[PDB]
Amino acid sequence: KNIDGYFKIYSKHTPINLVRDLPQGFSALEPLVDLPIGINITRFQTLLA
Amino acid sequence: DIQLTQSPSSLSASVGDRVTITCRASQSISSYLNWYQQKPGKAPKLLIYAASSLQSGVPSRFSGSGSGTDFTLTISSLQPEDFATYYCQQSYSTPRTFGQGTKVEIK
Amino acid sequence: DIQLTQSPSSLSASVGDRVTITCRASQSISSYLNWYQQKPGKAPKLLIYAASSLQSGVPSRFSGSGSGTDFTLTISSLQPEDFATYYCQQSYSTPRTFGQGTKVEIK
Amino acid sequence: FNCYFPLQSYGFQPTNVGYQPYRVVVLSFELLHAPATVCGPKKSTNL
Amino acid sequence: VQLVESGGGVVQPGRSLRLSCAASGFTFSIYGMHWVRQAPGKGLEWVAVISYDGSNKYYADSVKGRFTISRDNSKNTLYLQMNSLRAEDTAVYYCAKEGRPSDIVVVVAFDYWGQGTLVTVSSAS
Amino acid sequence: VQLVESGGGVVQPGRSLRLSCAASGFTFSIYGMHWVRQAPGKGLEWVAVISYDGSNKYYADSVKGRFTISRDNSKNTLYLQMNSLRAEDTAVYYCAKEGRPSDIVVVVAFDYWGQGTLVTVSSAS
Ligand SMILES: *[C@@H]1O[C@H](CO)[C@@H](O[C@@H]2O[C@H](CO)[C@@H](O)[C@H](O)[C@H]2NC(C)=O)[C@H](O)[C@H]1NC(C)=O
């Protein structure tokens, strides 16, 4: 999420066994970093190997 | 003592030329030169103070610049009445001293 | 190809004598001859460039003059180290060319 | 007067003081709607 | 603002003389005052400075011990007591006022000069 | 600034030879570079010039077509390729640099030369 021009990343890694869809579980995500991009972001691309 | 050395000691140039007179201090005084114009037989006239501020009534062609140890007096375009002896002078600490003098003559 | 001719091709003179070497260009270059001094077995040394201005390290006895097509190399007071072959050289246009050389000899 | 290669060279030699080579660093300071990543430190006071 | 100098003349070597600089056109009692001398055909040489109240007095290297600067804020007059005169002290002496042109007051500067008076140290008649 | 030459010697008429001029002590890549020859006992004859970047190339009339100047700005070396050598091409060849006084940048003068290398075109053993 981008707040006040400050680009914020919240992350959480969990092992799962249901490969089909998202599990019915609760996970709490904690902050990684804050960064100053500050633009009219309208798109984002995932990058896959 | 803070020693101020002017260079050149003298120079010849013609009206309309751009001249540059340098005064270098033995130690950094960091804004404290004062530039004067002296004519033979009369007391000097102040030109530039704090090495970069033009004193009232002096033409805008006169300009000084620099801080620390390297300083310059510049006259953009010479006129006949500007041919004279110019002294730098420090005020950073006592005793106050002068440069040895720079004479501007006609070429 | 602009041709440079030096006159005389050689001359005999004594120490202290006033020595004159002339270089004539086929067409006007008007300030662009360069004068060189060469001792046998060693590379030439630039003496005058732009046909009237002295190289740093060259004694003041060496003087250049002339403009257009008529140029002069002059040594005010001939010295023992001035006995050598002297070349004029033009840089106005390409290709660059040399005069034939004037040999200053001992009378 | 045609061309004049602009990159002429200063000749630096002790014989040259108005022409004395001096090494200069220029600082330009600017801030644009971002955290000031440049800061001034403050020392620890004993708690 | 006017600075009238006087006290010059011929003095034999080794005697004494007092120079005067009468101040007018400004509040004298708030400014430092300087003496500046110019040997005949030579450059300017700072001589002596006195604080506004006369409690602080500094002198140049060549005149320590011999020269005494003094002040009279009532008459607005500046004095320079010169003693043990010698041949090298021959110079046109100026009184001068501190002054500062604008707000860069952290410059403390130099300004308007008196007309200068000639002092000749000589045994000639 | 050093200009050390090599590659001279005796060659039978009509064959080819390569002169090399290693430069040091200055920025090689931005200067024009010259060749000048002097046959035994005669005057100085200009040979060839190459631009700083190797694009502009001019030669004397007597060497047009046969002589090729070249440049390697990586090793800071000047070359002159000699082809169809003849008797009149026997000479001592100098490599040299343009050079100027700077203030006067309206001359494009001459300056430091190589020491020179001898090229003798003769079929004698
Ligand atoms: C951010 O960029 C978008 C376009 O990618 C801007 O959306 C346009 O807004 C104008 C109004 O000023 C509309 O006329 C356009 O039709 C919009 N574009 C599209 C594709 O609909 C948006 O205004 C920008 N944000 C800001 C604050 O200027």
Side-chain angles (χ1 to χ4, degrees), chain A, chain B, chain C, chain D residues 1-38 40-41 43-47, chain E, chain F:
Chain A
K1 66 161 140 184
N2 172 290
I3 298 284
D4 186 74
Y6 284 30
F7 183 76
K8 296 181 181 180
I9 298 96
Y10 301 163
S11 172
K12 181 39 152 43
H13 294 25
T14 183
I16 63 168
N17 294 319
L18 179 45
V19 309
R20 276 70 174 175
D21 284 329
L22 283 193
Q24 293 181 356
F26 197 98
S27 290
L29 288 67
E30 64 271 13
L32 269 293
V33 67
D34 172 48
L35 294 174
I37 182 67
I39 62 170
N40 182 9
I41 303 99
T42 64
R43 269 178 319 296
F44 75 97
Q45 303 301 110
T46 182
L47 312 184
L48 61 83
Chain B
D1 189 358
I2 301 182
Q3 290 301 110
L4 277 67
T5 62
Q6 304 178 213
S7 58
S9 290
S10 73
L11 61 83
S12 281
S14 296
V15 298
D17 186 73
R18 173 185 300 301
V19 71
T20 290
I21 296 91
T22 300
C23 182
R24 282 183 181 92
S26 60
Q27 183 214 340
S28 184
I29 69 180
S30 181
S31 60
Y32 285 67
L33 282 71
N34 297 295
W35 288 90
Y36 313 93
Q37 184 194 66
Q38 188 190 30
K39 297 296 289 183
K42 65 175 72 68
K45 293 183 198 297
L46 171 63
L47 303 176
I48 308 287
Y49 58 106
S52 75
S53 65
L54 202 173
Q55 190 272 331
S56 183
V58 171
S60 52
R61 59 177 182 268
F62 286 97
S63 69
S65 59
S67 72
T69 79
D70 213 328
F71 309 85
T72 293
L73 174 70
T74 292
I75 297 89
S76 51
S77 175
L78 316 186
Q79 293 82 17
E81 69 275 16
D82 299 344
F83 298 159
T85 302
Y86 298 88
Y87 296 84
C88 57
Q89 186 272 335
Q90 68 86 27
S91 305
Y92 184 83
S93 62
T94 53
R96 275 72 165 90
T97 54
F98 281 85
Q100 80 280 3
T102 300
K103 302 162 317 301
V104 173
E105 41 275 29
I106 179 63
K107 174 80 156 295
Chain C
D1 201 297
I2 301 181
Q3 292 298 109
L4 303 177
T5 310
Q6 308 179 218
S7 60
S9 290
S10 72
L11 62 85
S12 281
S14 296
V15 193
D17 286 353
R18 181 67 156 248
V19 170
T20 290
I21 294 160
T22 69
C23 180
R24 54 203 51 65
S26 58
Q27 76 196 56
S28 186
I29 63 171
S30 180
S31 60
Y32 285 69
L33 282 179
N34 317 311
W35 290 90
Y36 301 91
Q37 182 193 68
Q38 190 185 27
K39 289 291 187 242
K42 194 202 91 53
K45 293 184 198 297
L46 172 65
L47 308 176
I48 308 285
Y49 42 79
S52 74
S53 65
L54 190 68
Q55 171 73 355
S56 66
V58 178
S60 54
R61 63 178 182 273
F62 290 97
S63 68
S65 64
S67 64
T69 59
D70 295 358
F71 303 81
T72 295
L73 173 70
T74 294
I75 309 169
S76 55
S77 80
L78 200 62
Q79 298 298 308
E81 71 278 18
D82 299 343
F83 295 103
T85 303
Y86 295 87
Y87 299 87
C88 55
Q89 191 276 330
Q90 64 87 29
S91 65
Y92 180 75
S93 62
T94 55
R96 277 75 167 93
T97 55
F98 284 90
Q100 81 280 5
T102 296
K103 190 154 183 167
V104 174
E105 295 149 357
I106 312 169
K107 184 62 221 73
Chain D
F1 275 79
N2 187 331
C3 279
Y4 293 93
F5 186 64
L7 277 296
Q8 293 82 18
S9 68
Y10 284 28
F12 297 147
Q13 190 67 36
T15 43
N16 291 138
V17 172
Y19 292 167
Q20 204 68 252
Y22 293 135
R23 183 177 292 171
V24 64
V25 60
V26 173
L27 279 165
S28 196
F29 292 163
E30 206 285 332
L31 75 167
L32 283 174
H33 213 177
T37 61
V38 183
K43 276 70 66 179
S44 183
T45 50
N46 204 1
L47 73 170
Chain E
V1 164
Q2 294 80 17
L3 296 177
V4 191
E5 312 187 45
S6 67
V10 179
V11 293
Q12 312 333 295
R15 70 176 60 250
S16 304
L17 185 51
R18 201 183 77 163
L19 301 187
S20 293
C21 177
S24 68
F26 63 96
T27 187
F28 182 74
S29 61
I30 194 66
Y31 284 160
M33 294 299 291
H34 299 247
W35 281 102
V36 169
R37 73 177 168 183
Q38 176 166 224
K42 299 287 218 63
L44 279 67
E45 194 191 22
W46 174 76
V47 176
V49 60
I50 182 161
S51 67
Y52 66 99
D53 53 3
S55 64
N56 300 331
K57 305 169 307 320
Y58 290 5
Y59 303 89
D61 55 24
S62 52
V63 299
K64 297 184 290 294
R66 317 188 276 112
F67 283 18
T68 299
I69 192 170
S70 63
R71 209 187 171 119
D72 188 334
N73 286 326
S74 174
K75 316 202 72 53
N76 292 351
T77 307
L78 172 79
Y79 305 102
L80 185 60
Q81 185 66 44
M82 71 205 318
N83 300 305
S84 300
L85 277 296
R86 290 182 290 115
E88 65 196 13
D89 292 331
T90 63
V92 172
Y93 282 71
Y94 300 103
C95 56
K97 153 190 171 294
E98 278 294 357
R100 60 152 149 264
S102 297
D103 57 13
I104 62 171
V105 296
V106 65
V107 56
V108 65
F110 204 82
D111 74 8
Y112 181 76
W113 301 64
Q115 79 281 355
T117 187
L118 175 60
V119 179
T120 315
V121 183
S122 159
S123 55
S125 66
Chain F
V1 166
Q2 292 82 18
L3 299 174
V4 57
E5 312 186 46
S6 293
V10 180
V11 291
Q12 323 319 334
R15 70 175 61 252
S16 303
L17 182 150
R18 187 65 171 270
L19 293 187
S20 294
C21 174
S24 66
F26 67 98
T27 187
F28 182 76
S29 60
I30 70 167
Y31 280 89
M33 187 66 203
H34 298 245
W35 285 100
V36 173
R37 73 178 170 185
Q38 181 163 45
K42 65 152 301 193
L44 295 172
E45 300 304 284
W46 181 77
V47 174
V49 61
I50 183 159
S51 67
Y52 68 100
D53 55 3
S55 63
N56 297 153
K57 300 171 75 66
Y58 303 110
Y59 305 87
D61 55 357
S62 54
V63 299
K64 297 296 289 183
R66 317 186 275 112
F67 283 15
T68 297
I69 190 175
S70 67
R71 209 185 171 117
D72 188 333
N73 285 326
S74 174
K75 64 192 301 173
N76 296 352
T77 306
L78 169 77
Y79 303 108
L80 185 63
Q81 182 69 45
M82 285 178 142
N83 299 306
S84 301
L85 289 154
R86 290 183 290 115
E88 65 196 12
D89 294 330
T90 296
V92 173
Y93 285 73
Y94 303 101
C95 60
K97 152 193 172 296
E98 293 179 353
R100 52 183 175 270
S102 179
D103 43 358
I104 61 170
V105 189
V106 176
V107 176
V108 176
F110 207 81
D111 63 358
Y112 202 95
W113 301 60
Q115 79 284 355
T117 192
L118 176 60
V119 178
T120 314
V121 185
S122 161
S123 54
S125 300

mmCIF file with all atom_site columns, all heavy atoms in Angstrom, chain F residues 56-73:
data_model
loop_
_atom_site.group_PDB
_atom_site.id
_atom_site.type_symbol
_atom_site.label_atom_id
_atom_site.label_alt_id
_atom_site.label_comp_id
_atom_site.label_asym_id
_atom_site.label_entity_id
_atom_site.label_seq_id
_atom_site.pdbx_PDB_ins_code
_atom_site.Cartn_x
_atom_site.Cartn_y
_atom_site.Cartn_z
_atom_site.occupancy
_atom_site.B_iso_or_equiv
_atom_site.pdbx_formal_charge
_atom_site.auth_seq_id
_atom_site.auth_comp_id
_atom_site.auth_asym_id
_atom_site.auth_atom_id
_atom_site.pdbx_PDB_model_num
ATOM 1   N N   . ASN F 1 56 ? 39.926 11.694 -39.620 1.00 0.00 ? 56 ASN F N   1
ATOM 2   C CA  . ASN F 1 56 ? 40.473 12.673 -40.549 1.00 0.00 ? 56 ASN F CA  1
ATOM 3   C C   . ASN F 1 56 ? 41.917 12.307 -40.849 1.00 0.00 ? 56 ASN F C   1
ATOM 4   O O   . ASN F 1 56 ? 42.737 12.197 -39.932 1.00 0.00 ? 56 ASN F O   1
ATOM 5   C CB  . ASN F 1 56 ? 40.391 14.082 -39.963 1.00 0.00 ? 56 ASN F CB  1
ATOM 6   C CG  . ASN F 1 56 ? 38.969 14.521 -39.714 1.00 0.00 ? 56 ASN F CG  1
ATOM 7   O OD1 . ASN F 1 56 ? 38.708 15.343 -38.836 1.00 0.00 ? 56 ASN F OD1 1
ATOM 8   N ND2 . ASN F 1 56 ? 38.042 14.003 -40.511 1.00 0.00 ? 56 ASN F ND2 1
ATOM 9   N N   . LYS F 1 57 ? 42.220 12.097 -42.127 1.00 0.00 ? 57 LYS F N   1
ATOM 10  C CA  . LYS F 1 57 ? 43.527 11.592 -42.523 1.00 0.00 ? 57 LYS F CA  1
ATOM 11  C C   . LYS F 1 57 ? 43.993 12.326 -43.768 1.00 0.00 ? 57 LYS F C   1
ATOM 12  O O   . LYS F 1 57 ? 43.300 12.322 -44.789 1.00 0.00 ? 57 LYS F O   1
ATOM 13  C CB  . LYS F 1 57 ? 43.465 10.081 -42.773 1.00 0.00 ? 57 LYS F CB  1
ATOM 14  C CG  . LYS F 1 57 ? 43.040 9.283  -41.545 1.00 0.00 ? 57 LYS F CG  1
ATOM 15  C CD  . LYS F 1 57 ? 42.778 7.831  -41.877 1.00 0.00 ? 57 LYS F CD  1
ATOM 16  C CE  . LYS F 1 57 ? 44.075 7.093  -42.089 1.00 0.00 ? 57 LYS F CE  1
ATOM 17  N NZ  . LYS F 1 57 ? 44.837 7.027  -40.816 1.00 0.00 ? 57 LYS F NZ  1
ATOM 18  N N   . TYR F 1 58 ? 45.161 12.959 -43.679 1.00 0.00 ? 58 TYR F N   1
ATOM 19  C CA  . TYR F 1 58 ? 45.752 13.670 -44.802 1.00 0.00 ? 58 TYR F CA  1
ATOM 20  C C   . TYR F 1 58 ? 47.221 13.298 -44.924 1.00 0.00 ? 58 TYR F C   1
ATOM 21  O O   . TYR F 1 58 ? 47.876 12.953 -43.937 1.00 0.00 ? 58 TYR F O   1
ATOM 22  C CB  . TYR F 1 58 ? 45.601 15.190 -44.658 1.00 0.00 ? 58 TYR F CB  1
ATOM 23  C CG  . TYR F 1 58 ? 44.165 15.637 -44.506 1.00 0.00 ? 58 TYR F CG  1
ATOM 24  C CD1 . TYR F 1 58 ? 43.701 16.144 -43.301 1.00 0.00 ? 58 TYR F CD1 1
ATOM 25  C CD2 . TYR F 1 58 ? 43.277 15.559 -45.571 1.00 0.00 ? 58 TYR F CD2 1
ATOM 26  C CE1 . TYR F 1 58 ? 42.390 16.555 -43.159 1.00 0.00 ? 58 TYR F CE1 1
ATOM 27  C CE2 . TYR F 1 58 ? 41.963 15.964 -45.437 1.00 0.00 ? 58 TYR F CE2 1
ATOM 28  C CZ  . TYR F 1 58 ? 41.525 16.463 -44.228 1.00 0.00 ? 58 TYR F CZ  1
ATOM 29  O OH  . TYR F 1 58 ? 40.219 16.874 -44.081 1.00 0.00 ? 58 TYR F OH  1
ATOM 30  N N   . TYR F 1 59 ? 47.731 13.373 -46.151 1.00 0.00 ? 59 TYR F N   1
ATOM 31  C CA  . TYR F 1 59 ? 49.093 12.964 -46.454 1.00 0.00 ? 59 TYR F CA  1
ATOM 32  C C   . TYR F 1 59 ? 49.739 13.975 -47.387 1.00 0.00 ? 59 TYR F C   1
ATOM 33  O O   . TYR F 1 59 ? 49.059 14.740 -48.076 1.00 0.00 ? 59 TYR F O   1
ATOM 34  C CB  . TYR F 1 59 ? 49.136 11.573 -47.098 1.00 0.00 ? 59 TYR F CB  1
ATOM 35  C CG  . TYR F 1 59 ? 48.455 10.501 -46.286 1.00 0.00 ? 59 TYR F CG  1
ATOM 36  C CD1 . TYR F 1 59 ? 47.096 10.254 -46.424 1.00 0.00 ? 59 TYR F CD1 1
ATOM 37  C CD2 . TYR F 1 59 ? 49.172 9.735  -45.381 1.00 0.00 ? 59 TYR F CD2 1
ATOM 38  C CE1 . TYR F 1 59 ? 46.473 9.274  -45.682 1.00 0.00 ? 59 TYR F CE1 1
ATOM 39  C CE2 . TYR F 1 59 ? 48.560 8.754  -44.636 1.00 0.00 ? 59 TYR F CE2 1
ATOM 40  C CZ  . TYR F 1 59 ? 47.209 8.526  -44.790 1.00 0.00 ? 59 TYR F CZ  1
ATOM 41  O OH  . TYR F 1 59 ? 46.590 7.547  -44.048 1.00 0.00 ? 59 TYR F OH  1
ATOM 42  N N   . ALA F 1 60 ? 51.068 13.963 -47.407 1.00 0.00 ? 60 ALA F N   1
ATOM 43  C CA  . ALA F 1 60 ? 51.804 14.775 -48.360 1.00 0.00 ? 60 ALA F CA  1
ATOM 44  C C   . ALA F 1 60 ? 51.595 14.237 -49.773 1.00 0.00 ? 60 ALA F C   1
ATOM 45  O O   . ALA F 1 60 ? 51.249 13.072 -49.976 1.00 0.00 ? 60 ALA F O   1
ATOM 46  C CB  . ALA F 1 60 ? 53.294 14.801 -48.017 1.00 0.00 ? 60 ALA F CB  1
ATOM 47  N N   . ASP F 1 61 ? 51.809 15.112 -50.758 1.00 0.00 ? 61 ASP F N   1
ATOM 48  C CA  . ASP F 1 61 ? 51.528 14.748 -52.144 1.00 0.00 ? 61 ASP F CA  1
ATOM 49  C C   . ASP F 1 61 ? 52.401 13.591 -52.614 1.00 0.00 ? 61 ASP F C   1
ATOM 50  O O   . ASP F 1 61 ? 51.940 12.715 -53.354 1.00 0.00 ? 61 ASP F O   1
ATOM 51  C CB  . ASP F 1 61 ? 51.706 15.967 -53.051 1.00 0.00 ? 61 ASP F CB  1
ATOM 52  C CG  . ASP F 1 61 ? 53.075 16.601 -52.919 1.00 0.00 ? 61 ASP F CG  1
ATOM 53  O OD1 . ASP F 1 61 ? 53.873 16.133 -52.083 1.00 0.00 ? 61 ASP F OD1 1
ATOM 54  O OD2 . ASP F 1 61 ? 53.353 17.573 -53.652 1.00 0.00 ? 61 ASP F OD2 1
ATOM 55  N N   . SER F 1 62 ? 53.666 13.573 -52.197 1.00 0.00 ? 62 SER F N   1
ATOM 56  C CA  . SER F 1 62 ? 54.600 12.546 -52.641 1.00 0.00 ? 62 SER F CA  1
ATOM 57  C C   . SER F 1 62 ? 54.318 11.178 -52.042 1.00 0.00 ? 62 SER F C   1
ATOM 58  O O   . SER F 1 62 ? 54.925 10.198 -52.487 1.00 0.00 ? 62 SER F O   1
ATOM 59  C CB  . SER F 1 62 ? 56.033 12.954 -52.297 1.00 0.00 ? 62 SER F CB  1
ATOM 60  O OG  . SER F 1 62 ? 56.154 13.260 -50.917 1.00 0.00 ? 62 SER F OG  1
ATOM 61  N N   . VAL F 1 63 ? 53.429 11.074 -51.058 1.00 0.00 ? 63 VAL F N   1
ATOM 62  C CA  . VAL F 1 63 ? 53.230 9.806  -50.367 1.00 0.00 ? 63 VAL F CA  1
ATOM 63  C C   . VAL F 1 63 ? 51.781 9.361  -50.509 1.00 0.00 ? 63 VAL F C   1
ATOM 64  O O   . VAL F 1 63 ? 51.394 8.306  -49.993 1.00 0.00 ? 63 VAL F O   1
ATOM 65  C CB  . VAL F 1 63 ? 53.640 9.912  -48.886 1.00 0.00 ? 63 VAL F CB  1
ATOM 66  C CG1 . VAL F 1 63 ? 55.114 10.278 -48.774 1.00 0.00 ? 63 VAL F CG1 1
ATOM 67  C CG2 . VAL F 1 63 ? 52.771 10.918 -48.156 1.00 0.00 ? 63 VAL F CG2 1
ATOM 68  N N   . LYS F 1 64 ? 50.974 10.160 -51.207 1.00 0.00 ? 64 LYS F N   1
ATOM 69  C CA  . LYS F 1 64 ? 49.571 9.824  -51.419 1.00 0.00 ? 64 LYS F CA  1
ATOM 70  C C   . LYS F 1 64 ? 49.434 8.450  -52.054 1.00 0.00 ? 64 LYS F C   1
ATOM 71  O O   . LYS F 1 64 ? 50.079 8.148  -53.060 1.00 0.00 ? 64 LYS F O   1
ATOM 72  C CB  . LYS F 1 64 ? 48.899 10.873 -52.308 1.00 0.00 ? 64 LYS F CB  1
ATOM 73  C CG  . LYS F 1 64 ? 48.855 12.270 -51.728 1.00 0.00 ? 64 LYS F CG  1
ATOM 74  C CD  . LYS F 1 64 ? 48.006 12.300 -50.477 1.00 0.00 ? 64 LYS F CD  1
ATOM 75  C CE  . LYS F 1 64 ? 46.538 12.124 -50.817 1.00 0.00 ? 64 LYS F CE  1
ATOM 76  N NZ  . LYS F 1 64 ? 45.682 12.227 -49.606 1.00 0.00 ? 64 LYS F NZ  1
ATOM 77  N N   . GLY F 1 65 ? 48.597 7.614  -51.450 1.00 0.00 ? 65 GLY F N   1
ATOM 78  C CA  . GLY F 1 65 ? 48.304 6.318  -52.020 1.00 0.00 ? 65 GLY F CA  1
ATOM 79  C C   . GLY F 1 65 ? 49.205 5.228  -51.487 1.00 0.00 ? 65 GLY F C   1
ATOM 80  O O   . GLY F 1 65 ? 48.754 4.107  -51.235 1.00 0.00 ? 65 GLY F O   1
ATOM 81  N N   . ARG F 1 66 ? 50.487 5.545  -51.311 1.00 0.00 ? 66 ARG F N   1
ATOM 82  C CA  . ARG F 1 66 ? 51.444 4.561  -50.824 1.00 0.00 ? 66 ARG F CA  1
ATOM 83  C C   . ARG F 1 66 ? 51.548 4.544  -49.308 1.00 0.00 ? 66 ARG F C   1
ATOM 84  O O   . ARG F 1 66 ? 51.698 3.467  -48.718 1.00 0.00 ? 66 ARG F O   1
ATOM 85  C CB  . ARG F 1 66 ? 52.831 4.824  -51.416 1.00 0.00 ? 66 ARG F CB  1
ATOM 86  C CG  . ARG F 1 66 ? 52.831 5.154  -52.897 1.00 0.00 ? 66 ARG F CG  1
ATOM 87  C CD  . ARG F 1 66 ? 54.249 5.250  -53.440 1.00 0.00 ? 66 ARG F CD  1
ATOM 88  N NE  . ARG F 1 66 ? 54.830 6.573  -53.241 1.00 0.00 ? 66 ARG F NE  1
ATOM 89  C CZ  . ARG F 1 66 ? 55.842 6.825  -52.417 1.00 0.00 ? 66 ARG F CZ  1
ATOM 90  N NH1 . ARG F 1 66 ? 56.391 5.839  -51.720 1.00 0.00 ? 66 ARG F NH1 1
ATOM 91  N NH2 . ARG F 1 66 ? 56.310 8.058  -52.294 1.00 0.00 ? 66 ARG F NH2 1
ATOM 92  N N   . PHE F 1 67 ? 51.465 5.701  -48.663 1.00 0.00 ? 67 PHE F N   1
ATOM 93  C CA  . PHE F 1 67 ? 51.674 5.801  -47.228 1.00 0.00 ? 67 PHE F CA  1
ATOM 94  C C   . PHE F 1 67 ? 50.337 5.882  -46.506 1.00 0.00 ? 67 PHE F C   1
ATOM 95  O O   . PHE F 1 67 ? 49.437 6.617  -46.922 1.00 0.00 ? 67 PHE F O   1
ATOM 96  C CB  . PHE F 1 67 ? 52.529 7.019  -46.877 1.00 0.00 ? 67 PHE F CB  1
ATOM 97  C CG  . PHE F 1 67 ? 53.995 6.830  -47.148 1.00 0.00 ? 67 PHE F CG  1
ATOM 98  C CD1 . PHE F 1 67 ? 54.438 5.789  -47.946 1.00 0.00 ? 67 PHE F CD1 1
ATOM 99  C CD2 . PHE F 1 67 ? 54.933 7.679  -46.583 1.00 0.00 ? 67 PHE F CD2 1
ATOM 100 C CE1 . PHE F 1 67 ? 55.784 5.611  -48.194 1.00 0.00 ? 67 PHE F CE1 1
ATOM 101 C CE2 . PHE F 1 67 ? 56.286 7.508  -46.828 1.00 0.00 ? 67 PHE F CE2 1
ATOM 102 C CZ  . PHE F 1 67 ? 56.710 6.472  -47.632 1.00 0.00 ? 67 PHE F CZ  1
ATOM 103 N N   . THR F 1 68 ? 50.219 5.123  -45.420 1.00 0.00 ? 68 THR F N   1
ATOM 104 C CA  . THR F 1 68 ? 49.003 5.061  -44.622 1.00 0.00 ? 68 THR F CA  1
ATOM 105 C C   . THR F 1 68 ? 49.362 5.318  -43.165 1.00 0.00 ? 68 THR F C   1
ATOM 106 O O   . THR F 1 68 ? 50.167 4.585  -42.584 1.00 0.00 ? 68 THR F O   1
ATOM 107 C CB  . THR F 1 68 ? 48.320 3.700  -44.770 1.00 0.00 ? 68 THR F CB  1
ATOM 108 O OG1 . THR F 1 68 ? 47.924 3.506  -46.133 1.00 0.00 ? 68 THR F OG1 1
ATOM 109 C CG2 . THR F 1 68 ? 47.092 3.623  -43.879 1.00 0.00 ? 68 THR F CG2 1
ATOM 110 N N   . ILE F 1 69 ? 48.769 6.353  -42.583 1.00 0.00 ? 69 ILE F N   1
ATOM 111 C CA  . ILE F 1 69 ? 48.907 6.650  -41.162 1.00 0.00 ? 69 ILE F CA  1
ATOM 112 C C   . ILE F 1 69 ? 47.762 5.971  -40.429 1.00 0.00 ? 69 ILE F C   1
ATOM 113 O O   . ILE F 1 69 ? 46.672 5.800  -40.987 1.00 0.00 ? 69 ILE F O   1
ATOM 114 C CB  . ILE F 1 69 ? 48.919 8.172  -40.913 1.00 0.00 ? 69 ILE F CB  1
ATOM 115 C CG1 . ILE F 1 69 ? 49.312 8.490  -39.470 1.00 0.00 ? 69 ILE F CG1 1
ATOM 116 C CG2 . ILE F 1 69 ? 47.566 8.787  -41.236 1.00 0.00 ? 69 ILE F CG2 1
ATOM 117 C CD1 . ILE F 1 69 ? 49.466 9.972  -39.203 1.00 0.00 ? 69 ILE F CD1 1
ATOM 118 N N   . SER F 1 70 ? 48.006 5.549  -39.192 1.00 0.00 ? 70 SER F N   1
ATOM 119 C CA  . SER F 1 70 ? 46.966 4.896  -38.411 1.00 0.00 ? 70 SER F CA  1
ATOM 120 C C   . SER F 1 70 ? 47.154 5.245  -36.941 1.00 0.00 ? 70 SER F C   1
ATOM 121 O O   . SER F 1 70 ? 48.124 5.903  -36.554 1.00 0.00 ? 70 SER F O   1
ATOM 122 C CB  . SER F 1 70 ? 46.969 3.382  -38.645 1.00 0.00 ? 70 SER F CB  1
ATOM 123 O OG  . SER F 1 70 ? 48.145 2.784  -38.136 1.00 0.00 ? 70 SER F OG  1
ATOM 124 N N   . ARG F 1 71 ? 46.214 4.785  -36.117 1.00 0.00 ? 71 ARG F N   1
ATOM 125 C CA  . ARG F 1 71 ? 46.169 5.174  -34.717 1.00 0.00 ? 71 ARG F CA  1
ATOM 126 C C   . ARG F 1 71 ? 45.538 4.061  -33.897 1.00 0.00 ? 71 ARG F C   1
ATOM 127 O O   . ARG F 1 71 ? 44.614 3.388  -34.360 1.00 0.00 ? 71 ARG F O   1
ATOM 128 C CB  . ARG F 1 71 ? 45.374 6.470  -34.535 1.00 0.00 ? 71 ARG F CB  1
ATOM 129 C CG  . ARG F 1 71 ? 45.812 7.309  -33.356 1.00 0.00 ? 71 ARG F CG  1
ATOM 130 C CD  . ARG F 1 71 ? 44.899 8.506  -33.178 1.00 0.00 ? 71 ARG F CD  1
ATOM 131 N NE  . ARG F 1 71 ? 45.168 9.210  -31.931 1.00 0.00 ? 71 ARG F NE  1
ATOM 132 C CZ  . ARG F 1 71 ? 45.605 10.462 -31.859 1.00 0.00 ? 71 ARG F CZ  1
ATOM 133 N NH1 . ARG F 1 71 ? 45.833 11.152 -32.966 1.00 0.00 ? 71 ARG F NH1 1
ATOM 134 N NH2 . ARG F 1 71 ? 45.818 11.020 -30.678 1.00 0.00 ? 71 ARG F NH2 1
ATOM 135 N N   . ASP F 1 72 ? 46.038 3.886  -32.675 1.00 0.00 ? 72 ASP F N   1
ATOM 136 C CA  . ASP F 1 72 ? 45.433 2.989  -31.690 1.00 0.00 ? 72 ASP F CA  1
ATOM 137 C C   . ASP F 1 72 ? 45.384 3.759  -30.375 1.00 0.00 ? 72 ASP F C   1
ATOM 138 O O   . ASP F 1 72 ? 46.375 3.814  -29.640 1.00 0.00 ? 72 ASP F O   1
ATOM 139 C CB  . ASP F 1 72 ? 46.216 1.686  -31.553 1.00 0.00 ? 72 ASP F CB  1
ATOM 140 C CG  . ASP F 1 72 ? 45.500 0.658  -30.687 1.00 0.00 ? 72 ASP F CG  1
ATOM 141 O OD1 . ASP F 1 72 ? 44.702 1.046  -29.809 1.00 0.00 ? 72 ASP F OD1 1
ATOM 142 O OD2 . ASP F 1 72 ? 45.731 -0.552 -30.892 1.00 0.00 ? 72 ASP F OD2 1
ATOM 143 N N   . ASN F 1 73 ? 44.224 4.346  -30.079 1.00 0.00 ? 73 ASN F N   1
ATOM 144 C CA  . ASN F 1 73 ? 44.057 5.136  -28.869 1.00 0.00 ? 73 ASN F CA  1
ATOM 145 C C   . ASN F 1 73 ? 44.052 4.294  -27.604 1.00 0.00 ? 73 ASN F C   1
ATOM 146 O O   . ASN F 1 73 ? 44.176 4.855  -26.512 1.00 0.00 ? 73 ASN F O   1
ATOM 147 C CB  . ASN F 1 73 ? 42.764 5.947  -28.950 1.00 0.00 ? 73 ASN F CB  1
ATOM 148 C CG  . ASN F 1 73 ? 42.879 7.129  -29.889 1.00 0.00 ? 73 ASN F CG  1
ATOM 149 O OD1 . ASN F 1 73 ? 43.941 7.738  -30.005 1.00 0.00 ? 73 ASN F OD1 1
ATOM 150 N ND2 . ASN F 1 73 ? 41.786 7.455  -30.571 1.00 0.00 ? 73 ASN F ND2 1
#
